[PDB]
Amino acid sequence: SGAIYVGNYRVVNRHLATHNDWANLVWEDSSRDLLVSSTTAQGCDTIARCDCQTGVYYCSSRRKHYPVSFSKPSLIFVEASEYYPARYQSHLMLAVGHSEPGDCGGILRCQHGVVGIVSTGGNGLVGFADVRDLLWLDEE
Numbered sequence: 001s002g003a004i005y006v007g008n009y010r011v012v013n014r015h016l017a018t019h020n021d022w023a024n025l026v027w028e029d030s031s032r033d034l035l036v037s038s039t040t041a042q043g044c045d046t047i048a049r050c051d052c053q054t055g056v057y058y059c060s061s062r063r064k065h066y067p068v069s070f071s072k073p074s075l076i077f078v079e080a081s082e083y084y085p086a087r088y089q090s091h092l093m094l095a096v097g098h099s100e101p102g103d104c105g106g107i108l109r110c111q112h113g114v115v116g117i118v119s120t121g122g123n124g125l126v127g128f129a130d131v132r133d134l135l136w137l138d139e140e
């Protein structure tokens, strides 16, 4: 579990969105595993606007933040799961690290701010849904 709270937006993994998220929908994209809903209170997170390929992610199954090197956001083949058929996920970045399904939602961050959230993994690899290109998270 986990979300990014920036301005009046809550950014969560689309496959973990609640009924309340769907009833206050702002934007969703299945190919990116992302859903954004509106909030009452303002959020404290800032979105990174950079091209960092090194950062730190939160791993709930270890209660630890790990430094990682990660690939540039791309279209990657992701295996069938209880949430999606075996399809290509877009804007996905890969790093060598520990993760389990419930680690989804952990923030990946750099010196500039929040870069993305845990979305895929298995076998020593963790994948993050990039959010740096979503310039509209900073305004409105």
Ligand SMILES: Cn1nc(C(=O)N[C@H]2C[C@H]2CO)c2ccccc21
Pocket (backbone or CB within 6 Å): 015, 033, 078, 079, 080, 081, 083, 084, 099, 100, 101, 102, 103, 104, 118, 119, 120, 121, 122, 123, 126, 127
């Ligand atoms: C971080 N993480 N996430 C998933 C996962 O199954 N996510 C579901 C949304 C769909 C994408 O494949 C996973 C599995 C096994 C180890 C790690 C994992």
Ligand SMILES: [Zn+2]
Pocket (backbone or CB within 6 Å): 048, 049, 050, 051, 052, 110, 111, 112, 113
């Ligand atoms: Zn950065």
